[model samples]
Target: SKRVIVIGGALAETAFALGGAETPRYRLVGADTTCTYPDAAKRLPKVGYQRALSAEGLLSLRPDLVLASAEAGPPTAIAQVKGAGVTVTTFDERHDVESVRAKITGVAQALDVRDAGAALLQRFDRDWQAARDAVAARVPGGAQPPRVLFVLNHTGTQALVAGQRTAADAMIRYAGARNAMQGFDHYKPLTTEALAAAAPDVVLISDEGLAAVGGHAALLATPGFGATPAGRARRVVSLDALFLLGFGPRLPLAVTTLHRRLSDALA
Candidate 1:
């Protein structure tokens, strides 16, 4: 029903997930450079990262509808895109199951493909419940919920991490652990005092940037992380960044994997 251009990585993943065999109404005109998934989407024209995109680059694509995330761009860019008569749809940054369902349904509805939306949402529901059941069965009684910290960066001397409302927090919950930084709502500059206070139980790293963060040795050497439960137990786990954090179609599978990792760490 529409020719669409997706401007965000995770949003693009959702589009590709819904556009399946037999018939695909929307032709994926373009996606941002960081939009990597479904193999086919990676080879498409690049519009640059969503927030980093320029008007010239995006307008040049000649898209009828621009489906992007609220987190994708600066306010000016969003306004400019809207001014061009291109339908711009923005999804929330929430990372929970119902939120993911809403995202899927919203994208499909925007494209006038509600039937497809229902089917996709059903699949997510079934898988998510299955994983939830598995985790409920395996959760040990009297076992403390491990304190999890999702580390985004730990380069040389500087450290950065995920905060509340971010994908990392969502993954931590799905993985059946506690996000120690729940008090804060966004990523803040890391400090020795803060890290010491948080005292993470499991330090989760994205697979893409694990090496850049200095891996286990880097975490082990970090000023305040070393004495924490995460450090003491060596429960640092690295998972695929997209699958673990994207909160898209693979979320259930990802949560299942995280549950396995955390459970094994406890054992």
Candidate 2:
């Protein structure tokens, strides 16, 4: 971890989990905009968004190693950084249990903290298992999973709802709820009739998406919303986007927290 710069939020979080915040081996010097967790990353100079980055911005940090996400940088930046003779390690970024574990292990190897990585994985497994059990307990006795619709964006004329292959869908499943919408593969704008037809038991929205619509008062005004069980009973839950979707070290925490919210709102 000699003078390492991290480019993804979850990647940065994994570094901090290995004690990057205080330890020399995991020392972090620069980060991407999405790297906004663990306080340490927030304090670092951001190289910019992971997808499009500035070579000079990263090179200026004088990093010995740059740990980037698979979603990182225009090929030029990755090229120039390596052209400068700095070692660049990019980890595959995806949404799943195995992916999270891979990130932790990859970052640990990058930082040469194998022992820490093992311990971290152990904790992650235990907590993740507990989270699953909690969700199972909440919806016990072969009950139907709560029908949840996740609003990913609003404020724009075309508001979007999550379907398969979306972070929202992943979170919904992790929280032990079934996605309300069944006939889609990505975030799609739902017509009022379609929204009403889905009949979500709970509406999960990102705080950012909620803010975009102005507030709960405004979101409740969506014609589709007002017609559903979630709308009629006012069952809406808002949370930070990355915390819910990062699929990193915080995966268990996110699932656990969402499960609790879905439970309370459904109650």
Candidate 3:
């Protein structure tokens, strides 16, 4: 009804999609920094990134409701926002499909848009099932799912790869791939020698970060990388940052995309 400020990335995108269909019913006022799907979202006032939000910054927007993610940062800030009497709906950041559906249903309920949420969930489930079938149809024969390394950060000389428990690795599993960094505890700077030994079949990087590395080509040119299975033919794939890691409605598409990409690497 009044101004709505989406505070997290996933909630922001989901709200915008539903809100778009609503048209003149509600005035969608603002979205945070990570809310970057529709460029028009940027035109709205940027409250801030989830983890870096400040009470003063958010209050400045005079939002009627703050639709937040359960993952939004600095626990204290979220508490402060609630203390300020802003209606904060915190949705869980789940990487799995059922959990994601729960979040969508829950968010829709919170927004009092249950029917819209149901429709959205139905569409999402249909799309997800279709993607799953596509991926299942193409599983490589005798080929173990590629050992993937989800590179979270790169500084030319170093790389912070995601571990077994990370959202990134979860996405990889959802796509039917194995995380090569399974034994690790968290995001860690992997040794070039270790990576070479692990020898992942594919190298995956976020779209935005890949752009800075001069795309897949530049990424292949790095030293020691030349030895990994991914670097042999420069088997690098760049995926949309939000879709790959955000674990939202687009996630099934992300999985389908990854399955094809991994199968292609084998081919």
Candidate 4:
């Protein structure tokens, strides 16, 4: 079997899906720490994190192919790995269901499992339709979508909010909610005036981020947090970062769960 090493959460997860059966198309030798697909993580050895991946460490696994996202590099590390005569495939990861399907196809092509990839895409389509219908039923006709603010970090001294063109922004829309912050394209510091102005109905954050700041009370106490409607109502939703923003095979389920929760909170 050809040996493979996968990096980045989205790519790793899609690769795992393409290799669904007991005997996968290729041997998954190692993966990044952030690959949250439970079965894959349990079966494969962890190489390292994306931001600080060591080329030597990855090469040690003797992988025939390395699958990664475009954002998985500091240039030097990726270059070193590529220079070692290993095949490195990087895909442009976007924050949408179609992009997830594209990633699946890319990985399947790399692994020579086009049939499996097509099957997975069919499943994804079914799940997406079901998710959309379920979310619409809960939202009611012509109902106002809730304003959601996705916080990356909520330390008292400084905080970050997800704006346009981010995975968090796409996830918010998938859940039938609107992103609270606007006029930006990526994550930026949350300001008092901006938080009050956005007036979010709910605050969505990663579980790891919430743990980093000591949970809900601590987050609420942060500057510009407590004054918002979400803070006042204590409406905060914490989810695993990978599941929320990875835009992988589980995205339909993630979006459905988030939409239901947001709708319930509004009700």
Q: Taking the tens digit of each residue's C-alpha lDDT, what string does model 4 give over 59-89?
A: 8899888988776877898999999998999
Tell me how candidate 2 scores on lDDT: 0.83
What's model 4's overall lDDT? 0.82
For all predicted structures, in order, the TM-scores are 0.88, 0.84, 0.87, 0.89
What does candidate 1's lDDT look like per residue over 1-267, in tens digits?
Answer: 456788766667777777731135667788886577878778888977766778767888887788887677778877887898988888877777776887789887776668878998898899989999987776522287778788776233446777888888877776667787767887886677777788887778876567776567866677777768777877778887667776677788889998888777767
What are the RMSDs of all candidates, in order?
2.8, 3.1, 2.7, 2.6
Candidate 4 segments whose C-alpha is farther than 4 A from its true place:
20-25, 138-142, 154-158
Q: Which 10-residue window of candidate 3 scores lowest in summed lDDT?
A: 18-27
Residue 106 in model 1: lDDT = 84
Poorest lDDT segment (10 consecutive residues) of candidate 1? 17-26
What is each predicted model's overall lDDT from 0 to 1? 0.75, 0.83, 0.74, 0.82
lDDT by residue for model 3 over 1-267, one digit each (tens)?
Answer: 566788766666676666542344455688778788766666788877777788877878887777887777678887887898888877766567876787678667666677888899999999998988877775542367777777765324556778766678887787788887767765877578767766887777887767766667776776778788777867777687777787777777888887877777667
- Residue 151, candidate 3: Cα error in Å is 1.1
**Residue 199 accuracy (lDDT) in model 3:** 82
Error of 3 at 87 (Å): 2.4
Question: What TM value does model 2 have?
Answer: 0.84
Model 1 — TM-score against the truth?
0.88
